[PDB]
Amino acid sequence: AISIKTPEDIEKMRVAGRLAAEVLEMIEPYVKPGVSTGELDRICNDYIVNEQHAVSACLGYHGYPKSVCISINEVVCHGIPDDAKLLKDGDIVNIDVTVIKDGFHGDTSKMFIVGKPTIMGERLCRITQESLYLALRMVKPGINLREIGAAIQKFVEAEGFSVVREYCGHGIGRGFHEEPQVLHYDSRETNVVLKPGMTFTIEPMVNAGKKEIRTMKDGWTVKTKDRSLSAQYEHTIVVTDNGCEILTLRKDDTIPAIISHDE
Numbered sequence: 056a057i058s059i060k061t062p063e064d065i066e067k068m069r070v071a072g073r074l075a076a077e078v079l080e081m082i083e084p085y086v087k088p089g090v091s092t093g094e095l096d097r098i099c100n101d102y103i104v105n106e107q108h109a110v111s112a113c114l115g116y117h118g119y120p121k122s123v124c125i126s127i128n129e130v131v132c133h134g135i136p137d138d139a140k141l142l143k144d145g146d147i148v149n150i151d152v153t154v155i156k157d158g159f160h161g162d163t164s165k166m167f168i169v170g171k172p173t174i175m176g177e178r179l180c181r182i183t184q185e186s187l188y189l190a191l192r193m194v195k196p197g198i199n200l201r202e203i204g205a206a207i208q209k210f211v212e213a214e215g216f217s218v219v220r221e222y223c224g225h226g227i228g229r230g231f232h233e234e235p236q237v238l239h240y241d242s243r244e245t246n247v248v249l250k251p252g253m254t255f256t257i258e259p260m261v262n263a264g265k266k267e268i269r270t271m272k273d274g275w276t277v278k279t280k281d282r283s284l285s286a287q288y289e290h291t292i293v294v295t296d297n298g299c300e301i302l303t304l305r306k307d308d309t310i311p312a313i314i315s316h317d318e
């Protein structure tokens with residue numbers, strides 16, 4: 056039961072996706088040693104509401120208390136912005152932005168490396184982004200999502216890293232999470248043949264160590280069981296007649312927005 060967006064809906068998703076990307080471009084100069092994640096979230100929320108005239112989709116969702124998710128180092132996902140949590144040299148930090156504009160969602164995330172990188176953090180982030188990019192290059196009508204998940208997993212595991220099983224990409228539109236699920240690993244349960252006009256995210260979570268995760272007592276924060284680093288990147292796309300179009304591209308992305316597989 057996957058919805059096919061009309062041309063007009065796709066345009067609304069271009070607008071919302073651009074906004075989500077622009078939050079990430081806006082926040083970059085503030086992501087520096089010494090800043091708190093609480094401050095970063097306030098800057099993002101003020102921007103979303105006062106400048107973009109949009110709404111955070113995370114705020115209040117299942118009771119989530121903040122406007123963007125900010126996850127550092129061994130935190131896998133859903134980290135909660137906190138005025139007492141300060142960024143420091145060598146940290147890897149995901150900021151995940153999901154906004155609603157004119158009824159439609161845009162959803163994206165990226166890693167930031169704070170100050171002087173660690174080589175392992177830089178490698179983990181790079182491989183994670185590359186795994187997203189290889190998946191994006193596969194998207195076209197007639198391909199199965201299973202093939203995409205399997206390919207992400209093979210690539211990541213060859214680097215000695217692992218793919219988190221509990222979270223996945225998703226259909227997106229008027230709802231935050233819509234059909235289909237987009238698993239970043241191979242499953243016999245996956246059988247989804249892509250069609251033009253489907254809109255969904257790809258967003259692998261990749262651990263440097265083992266795949267297993269743990270949720271903290273705060274009921275939100277997810278960490279690697281082994282306290283290894285974890286990284287994630289996310290884009291929202293639309294399937295096109297000949298490939299896909301990335302709706303959340305930033306200037307710092309190094310893949311084209313429009314990917315075509317025709318001659």
Ligand SMILES: N=C1N=NC(N)=C1/N=N/c1cccc(C(=O)O)c1
Pocket residue numbers: 113116117119124133151152153162163223225258
């Ligand atoms: N921020 C997101 N981007 N893609 C997703 N699937 C994201 N999920 N975010 C949240 C945010 C708050 C709560 C939850 C939840 O599952 O309870 C999930």
Ligand SMILES: [Co+2]
Pocket residue numbers: 151152153162163164289
């Ligand atoms: Co997201």
Ligand SMILES: [Co+2]
Pocket residue numbers: 162163224225256258289
């Ligand atoms: Co998402």
Ligand code: NA
Pocket residue numbers: 126127128129130131132147149284285286
């Ligand atoms: Na992390």
